[PDB]
Amino acid sequence: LEAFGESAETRALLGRLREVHGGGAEREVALERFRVIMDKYQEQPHLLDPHLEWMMNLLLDIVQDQTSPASLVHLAFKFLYIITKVRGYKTFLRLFPHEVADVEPVLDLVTIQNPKDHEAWETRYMLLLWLSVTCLIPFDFSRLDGNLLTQPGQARMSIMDRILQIAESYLIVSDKARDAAAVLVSRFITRPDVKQSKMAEFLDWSLCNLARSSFQTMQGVITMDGTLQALAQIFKHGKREDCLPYAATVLRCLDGCRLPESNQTLLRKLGVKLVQRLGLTFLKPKVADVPEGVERVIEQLLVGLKDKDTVVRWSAAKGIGRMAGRLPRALADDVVGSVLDCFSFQETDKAWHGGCLALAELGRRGLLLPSRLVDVVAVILKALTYDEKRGACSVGTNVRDAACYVCWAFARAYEPQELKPFVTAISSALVIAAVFDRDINCRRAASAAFQENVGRQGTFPHGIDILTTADYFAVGNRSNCFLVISVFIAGFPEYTQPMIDHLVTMKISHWDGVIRELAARALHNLAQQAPEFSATQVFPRLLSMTLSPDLHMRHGSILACAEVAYALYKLAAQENRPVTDHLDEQAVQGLKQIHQQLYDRQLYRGLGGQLMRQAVCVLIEKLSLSKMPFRGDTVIDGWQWLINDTLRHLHLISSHSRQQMKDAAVSALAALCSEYYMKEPGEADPAIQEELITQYLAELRNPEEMTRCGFSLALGALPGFLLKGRLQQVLTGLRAVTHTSPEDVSFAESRRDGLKAIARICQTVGVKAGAPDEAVCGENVSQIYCALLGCMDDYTTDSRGDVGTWVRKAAMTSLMDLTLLLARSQPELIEAHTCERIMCCVAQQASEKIDRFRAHAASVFLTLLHFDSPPIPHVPHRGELEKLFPRSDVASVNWSAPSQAFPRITQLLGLPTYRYHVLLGLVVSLGGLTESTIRHSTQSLFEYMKGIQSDPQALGSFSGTLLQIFEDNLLNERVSVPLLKTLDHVLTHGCFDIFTTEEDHPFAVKLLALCKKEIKNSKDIQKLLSGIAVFCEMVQFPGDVRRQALLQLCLLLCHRFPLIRKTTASQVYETLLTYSDVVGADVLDEVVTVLSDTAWDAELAVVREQRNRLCDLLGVPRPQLV
Amino acid sequence: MRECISIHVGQAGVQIGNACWELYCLEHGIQPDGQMPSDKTIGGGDDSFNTFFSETGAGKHVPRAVFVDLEPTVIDEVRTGTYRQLFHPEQLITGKEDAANNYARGHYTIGKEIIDLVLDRIRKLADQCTGLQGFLVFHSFGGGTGSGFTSLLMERLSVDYGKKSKLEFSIYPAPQVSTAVVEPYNSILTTHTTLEHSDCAFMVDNEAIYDICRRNLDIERPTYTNLNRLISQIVSSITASLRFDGALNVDLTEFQTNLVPYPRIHFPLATYAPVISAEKAYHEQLSVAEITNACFEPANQMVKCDPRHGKYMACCLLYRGDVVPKDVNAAIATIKTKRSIQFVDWCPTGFKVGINYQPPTVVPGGDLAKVQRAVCMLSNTTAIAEAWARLDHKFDLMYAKRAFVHWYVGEGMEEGEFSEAREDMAALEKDYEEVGV
């Protein structure tokens, strides 16, 4: 925002006040419009400075007119107040009028205010501040009154007297006017005449208010806060020789008031404020004989730093800083020593915030002496690292903020030579914090302090270089500070060992898991800039931390060890040398005892068992990916075991960390099998290959589900050299699970994982034409495609919902991974029928009603269609599909959004091979329950039907396909109601208006019979309603079908459920009102009356007669009891 | 001699305890204030009723009980009740927050703050006793303070006092009395948790007692007072063996040897007769063979099952009042010549009979009537397995959806607890089927 680009709108809104002050709806609209326009500049209202005056004068020529009604004046004052909250009063009041002709017009307006009118509080607020901006006039209030003895019988009261009676009344109110009363007295008693006239009276009133008021009675607390604020403002904006005489009685009364013990945060803050206001009245202002009251003031202000709230701690720190700046240089040392006591071992973390704030306030003025450098600094080094856990919450944010504030105030508290001794401990602190700090406020707080230090002083090692990179915006993302900027800072030798030490000490022992993972990932990269230091000093450290009793510390140390080992292996892989060159025998000896020291302490149980398993699996993966020298050693046999047990106890892991555990275990198994299970180049161990495979295969039949789910992915992660002659068995074992058996009905995750495992195995072994038990060949490629397609019709619906859909997802990602592979090896294997079936299935799963599975299906379809290297052979209407989905438009498509998917999927009906499946899939969305999906699908279907409604051939083929879909899903509860609703919608829209010309069309003649057979003996209410609607829509077709529909509608009118009886008549009324040719005008006034008068929800025996009577009118044979 | 301590947790538990103590005071003649005019050995000593009442200096008979609850509402009625002078103020323990029908809360969150106080109170109460037998805990399975806290206290009592029995008097919930849908979820958890810390367990089917009150007692809508009185009558008929120096079941360790031949199988079936209404005070008369033939009726049992199919493992009859051994023998011969029954031939236990020559007692002004003789049959049977087949079934109905399960995991326990609990249920069912053959 560079300028106010809403001047005309605001001007019009302000001008409309004179013709919107008599409205209640328009008034609120204009207010809400003025508020939202002014709130845009709440973060930078200075841009509105050039406009302030004109808008202010506009609002003033409405409240400064004599023909202005109270209501119109109240809206102007509300607007005026809206401009004083955004710009603030201290800056917006300087433009208000201040002429001597504005003293009585403003006091007289202040004397017509209703104190009991809560709706007009903005008016009173704007009144008091205006009256206060008018007390600056450089004249005596006496010159203005003139002659008071002009009214005989009753003398007029003086202006000054009226103002004293206005301030005392507004200083005991409960609205916001009391705050405006605090700003008025500050500019009323601080002038010469008022000082000599009413100062004593106001002081007696205040001392009486704070001598009778309490912090328990509500109005008493209201009287306490206002009096304290008034006293503080008077002592702040008051002369020191007119005030010092009263400083002795004010403190004596405040001491007896007992504020520290009172249970009010505002009262204590105001009390500390008033105590620091009186404290400076005794000393002389300095520009860089100690009365006894100063000691009492200091004793009160040094007890306001241990408060339980920060609002009082900040005030106490400000008071201490303002007092130290006025006292001599001798008492300053004692004050600093007394303030330093807040950082004692027995003091809580709350006392540390106040101490650091006081230290910063003292350093800002330059009062700390050099002798206080070895101590104060020694404390700051700790305050920057304050981060403790007090039960379930964490504390240390405000401590670090105050530490950064103190650091930022040391660039002007000492000379460059005075602070030259601690530029190696403070530069390392600032940098370390700005780099690893958790909170973003502290990080940027440490960034600004370092900038100020390098700007003012400029003695820190590489100040400009560290400031250019680690700037205010660069430290915004925490991830960028740990993995990028950290390495850049460590590039220099002055910020390498300290940062690594701070990371290994505190960050590794942190309570947050994400922070530990980030610290480990940062150490991974930092080890590159210091391999020797990380291999000789950090590795022993982390190794000793893996034997700690702390769980989080053990996990962090294990992660750090794994990351350092991986980094050392990567670094050594460049020079083509073994990883043992970095780690010593003792180091590789301790990496073979981590797991045996955990399993022997039973550290794999409880809530920490999952974390320990994750850490050990990550360590095993990082060690196997480095080709460590543990081949032949029994330690390997241990690692493998720890994996199996995990896959055997996955159900024990929480539901919020089982997928990650399974993935990590599978990755560790994959890294281990392709490293420690190889006998020769290209071969594998016969004993292990046999035992592991037999165990895994026999495990697939365990009735437990999570075990099968884990072992599936385990099989799907084995290398290729271990399946050179065992594929014919692994594939059969995986396919045996993909089948749905009577016992494994609700077992969907097992098959979902088996499909993914088959995908991975097929991808690893590849294609070799001739070798069935070694690779995917033309002998074991058909079975695979048949097993993958048999899991695409998984519509299992249970109490958990449509869980089968999950399996379908695994069928879309698996079938793809196979196809793309064949095209990249032996495209001939991709048969035409199989490819057509896969495409039709993908089309159906992309025309579904769920939004996340439908979106996944469209992406898979586009990926399979946009494959050109080489082009997948046997693609029905390939060119048609390519023209319908150009590559340029696919870059921006919201497939998840039905609006941006249904109109693009409905066009597939034009293709014969897709027309059937696509419609079977779209029926579920056209007859589902989602309203938006129903609307979008119906609109997209009508947009396509409009193009083939006047075509007897296209419309006929569409109706035939719809009826074939209906027949194929006869008596199917998942396709009966949705398809019936779709037919009802299509009939209501009038798409089949051509078949209604002749009589007895082959379409309706069988559609009616199918609907009858579907609704024959049905108790579902939704199904009954759908059938009734279909039979009430099918009446448009003349011939025997019309008479049969009327007989069915009469049969349904007398159903067991009165609700159905009423709904049938309600729908028949609409059907008769729609089609007029169905019934002649000679018996039309006889049907509507019988339907409106007869109560179809009453006795069924009585309604049978009325219903039978409607059979003698419609001309429908009257049924009987069979 | 040896005494006993009864811990009453939950609402139903404290109600049953109050009813039992009222009935005991009415039988022994102890007035509400705690004045036994029949007692002569003041200060202390050894008597038949001393196993459940501690004597003070002023002759006050303080019941040896501990009523604990996580809410002050329920204990307020006891503190302000007619028996306020009977129980000691310290024996009543209250809590500020309840479990809201949750097992994890009562076993972790709220239980961890009150378990220490409960253990301290139990230790203080046991310091006066010279020889304790066990801990008669009273709870149910439809709440979170009756299952969770009960299991948490059993876990600590099995470690503090391992050489002491641990009898229970659970209350099997019903779908008509159910107050929550996660009522089963609590049941399974506490059942799996007290298996190795409980010798004998007594379960009360809510529907069975409801139907008994509707039919026998003749009540339109039986309330919780009507069901708390019958449970007190049952508890008194069962504890008469310990309160009157009965020959059969002299101590608590005999309940495990007579009615618990197998450690895992410890859920006997308890039935009682007769059940006359207050209106029909002198309408019909029942012999010792007409009341012993009424305890072999499914509708007269406390749990709905069909013992005629399965076989019995044990059997203990207890008569209370005017009963001659000849009448008992005649009733046994009648039961042995009329009804067809099966029994485990390889069981290390058999049939036992005991008599207590004491007149029955009923709460004056209540719905029950004073009878001349009473019978109580405690027989372990495989038919109780049916009572489980229902409970477990509901668990499955709530396991396929995992509804309301996250509330239990987000309080302390993990997810493997449910698999362990249902795995413990499968093993129990297999053991029952094996014993039934």
Ligand SMILES: Nc1nc2c(ncn2[C@@H]2O[C@H](COP(=O)(O)OP(=O)(O)OP(=O)(O)O)[C@@H](O)[C@H]2O)c(=O)[nH]1
């Ligand atoms: N027989 C009987 N059953 C009762 C009584 N009070 C409650 N119940 C049953 O006990 C179950 C409710 O448990 P409560 O004891 O009320 O609750 P709680 O165990 O104290 O636990 P929280 O509600 O979690 O504090 C349901 O099955 C009730 O029908 C009672 O006086 N007699």
Ligand SMILES: [Mg+2]
């Ligand atoms: Mg309760």
